Amino acid sequence: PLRRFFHDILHTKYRAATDVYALMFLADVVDFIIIIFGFWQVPEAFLVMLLIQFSTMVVDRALYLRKTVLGKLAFQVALVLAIHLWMFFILPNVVAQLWYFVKCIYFALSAYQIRCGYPTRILGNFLTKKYNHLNLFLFQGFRLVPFLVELRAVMDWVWTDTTLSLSSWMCVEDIYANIFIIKCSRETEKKYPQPKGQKKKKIVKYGMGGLIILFLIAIIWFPLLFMSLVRSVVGVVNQPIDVTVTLKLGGYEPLFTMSAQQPSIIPFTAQAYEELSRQFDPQPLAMQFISQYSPEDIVTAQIEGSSGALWR
Amino acid sequence: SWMCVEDIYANIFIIKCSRETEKKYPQPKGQKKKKIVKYGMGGLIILFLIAIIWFPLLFMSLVRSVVGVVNQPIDVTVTLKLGGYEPLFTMSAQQPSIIPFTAQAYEELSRQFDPQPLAMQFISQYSPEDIVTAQIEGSSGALWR
Amino acid sequence: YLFWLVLVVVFVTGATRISIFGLGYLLACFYLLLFGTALLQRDTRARLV
Amino acid sequence: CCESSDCLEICMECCGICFPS
Amino acid sequence: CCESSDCLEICMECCGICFPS
Amino acid sequence: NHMVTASAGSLVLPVLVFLWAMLSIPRPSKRFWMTAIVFTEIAVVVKYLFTDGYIKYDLVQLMALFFHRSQLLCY
Amino acid sequence: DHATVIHSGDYFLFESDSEE
Amino acid sequence: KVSPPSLGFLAGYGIMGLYVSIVLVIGKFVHGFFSEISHSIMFEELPCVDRILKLCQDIFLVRETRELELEEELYAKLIFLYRSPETMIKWTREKE
Amino acid sequence: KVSPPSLGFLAGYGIMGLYVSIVLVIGKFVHGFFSEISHSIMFEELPCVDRILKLCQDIFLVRETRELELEEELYAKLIFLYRSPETMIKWTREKE
């Protein structure tokens, strides 16, 4: 009984109406971003999480465009339980802690949508509302995302009740997008205009031009820099396991194979390294060699000398 | 100029086909385009996009997982390095002594360790003529030194 | 708010010294945190037993 | 029947898009 | 002040170039 | 708390925060807050009875849940 | 009728008849 | 020491190759703006776009109220505005 | 067993790399439709195209009969139809 009452009062109720889809989607975009960045069994896990973020965002769009509070309730319940059960499937972390955190924000804003309701006017692109600069910039980069524009169009078409086709739908979306961008620019020119026959202003030029040049620099040079930097880093210690000194003597039959292995080989400690470096400190390059090589790098060649292995 | 008339014609044909099909099968006004039509086209597009990203990954991984051709130890070199100073005991064998286990032989090993699931698993998962026999020689002659 | 800093100490005295006395301290905190705002204004002089 | 015809129409619409919508 | 406003406008028309200037 | 500890620790209260408290008639309830306090206390008790070397982020949890209780008692 | 109602546009719609 | 012994797929190449591919495709996405901006200056330098956003927003309003007959009719206006450049000039005039 | 010992060039990479390249370029080919379909809705949303296919087919007919003087003349019509969007509207009117 009590459960039924809770659900009844989460569906029928008498509350207000807010549109927090923008923020829910932004939370999911951040989640996607950090999972993509968090590629670090692990690739397979990150790929499944990708498909997941994506599928859940699509389902969210469906319920938003169909204004389903009951559907959102169901989705929320399922998702909460499933994401919390995925904490048990840790077997493939700061990245995961952050993913949990941002998904918690999504669950909080989603819960808000359910307990408030869906507003009558749901259609309309977020970044085409006002014609201040922030809306302009957000709309631009948001649309810039490779497949976001087309996904939005097709998806919306499938849920929204239309008489037309997808091509027709994409036409009105393109027109609107372009018209918004123009409007924002027109508005900003009315807010702040320059005079006629008046230099656009050295500074304006220097700024935009500079940014473009720097962006182009970061297309070619920066990747090279990053690449080389990583490659230069000598990753993990490589120490000779054994010291095999075969003093091949006899031209006919080379022998003298008295040698040693790991037990005799001593990975030099930090203190030991200091000793060697100081021994050869007068000679700059000698010390350099020792010092540059990381501690527990320089290994000790304690080659065995005793015999028994007969000369042949 | 030639390419111009070809482009015009191509586009004009595509338009004509669409116009003809709309005359053959028309639609009413203020009339939902039909849930099903939407579901179909949209679905196909989504699936095509799925096959751009996921399907290649699937295929790639699948092929990589396949362990292609049998790799069996040619020789069983057991050097029982004993003496700390002079490690010896190098009595060992090669391919003649090494026996690529047959299908029947594999069954035997699997059944021997059948009670333990993972033990049997190891043997059974490894393909027949995979598990090789380490018949290492023990006789000496080679002196310790 | 001193009534309450003592409640904090009561909790942490139990936590630190893992024993049976510590479980008792933990319980004493739990209780006087629940039934506590009542006797913060009723035990001011009226029987601080 | 009607359902099949509708499916065919949807298919055409989709593959219609295959050359400038 | 004025300089800051001009700068704002600079990067602003620069992002104007981010989806058809 | 679910980001610092896992398994049975948390994953009961966070689930309930998302599915009961935030999905409710205005202010959660009284039973939610009571069950939160109760679960946190039980968790503390059983972690004290030993998981070994138990952590106490449930101190700041219990005390924040009793602070909210005081705020809502004053209304 | 779609086929016909989406292909019915003419110049008369765009006349400036008190478009507020 | 050796230089590359890191983990996560192939630090040397699986994630690395994917990253490169992404960068390139994002490259093309961003070029998609600053490459052919000059092929539209014959329908993009329109002044006032207020009358066109009204049309666009009316299509949206008519889809929320589910009067989809008028959706088809208002779409017809949109496509004719964009089919005749001279009417765009008329409709996008600064004042009237 | 080892995992990759197959033949045919390099099963690991020659044919494999070529396949990937093909897929990408076919990718761009297919994108060539569903990317800028909206930049033509000003010259491509025409109703009746019957009069334009007649023109196109007349160019073809006049090339088979080798009267290439009229090829130049009919090409002139085609290019003016596509030079003035308003005449396209007139020529592509549904009825007349």
Residue numbers in the entry:
A (entry chain A): 1941 to 1980, 1999 to 2050, 2060 to 2279
B (entry chain D): 2135 to 2279
C (entry chain A): 1165 to 1213
D (entry chain E), E (entry chain C): 227 to 247
F (entry chain A): 1698 to 1747, 1779 to 1803
G (entry chain A): 1408 to 1427
H (entry chain A), I (entry chain D): 2426 to 2521
Authors' own words:
PIEZO channels transmit mechanical force signals to cells, allowing them to make critical decisions during development and in pathophysiological conditions. Here, we report several near-atomic resolution cryo-EM structures of fast-inactivating wild-type human PIEZO1 (hPIEZO1) and its slow-inactivating channelopathy mutants with or without its auxiliary subunit MDFIC. Each hPIEZO1 subunit has a curved blade structure, and the three subunits form the trimeric PIEZO channel, exhibiting a bowl-like shape. MDFIC, a MyoD family inhibitor protein, has recently been identified as an auxiliary subunit of piezo channels capable of decelerating channel inactivation and attenuating channel mechanosensitivity.
